[PDB]
Design a protein around this ligand. Sequence first.
Ligand code: HEC
Length: 116
Amino acid sequence: DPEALAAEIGPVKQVSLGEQIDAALAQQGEQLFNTYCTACHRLDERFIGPALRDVTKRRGPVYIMNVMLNPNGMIQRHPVMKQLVQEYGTMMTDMALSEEQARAILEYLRQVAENQ
Ligand code: HEC
């Protein structure tokens, strides 16, 4: 169970989502994605790392939060991230992100999956 494994690696164990996307939180997330993530990721194609538009359809939220917050631990202990390092070659590394920043980015990722 890859989401169970992500929760065991940490740091995040659980997330709170409302019934709908919080649009202001998603906008904050967009800005933070530009700042932290666009250097290596696109929404609709591979780049330095994988395409992200549908990551919330493919992966659980605790996985996505812990890749952002603890990419080194995820690469060391989570089989999906380890396979992606074999595929992509370069590594995602610590960005000194806080949980609230990562939760905003996750909100943005939920939004772009809806935008299609
Ligand atoms: C280049 C230096 C990176 C930065 C900046 C960010 N990511 Fe990344 N990410 C990168 C690669 C090369 C990979 C594959 C694994 C590896 O380390 O080689 C990834 C992977 C992800 C994943 C997993 C995707 C999956 O299909 O499971 C996610 C969810 C992810 N990256 C998210 C993400 C976000 C939100 C970023 C900004 C906070 C971010 N990454 C930065 C390379 C790079």
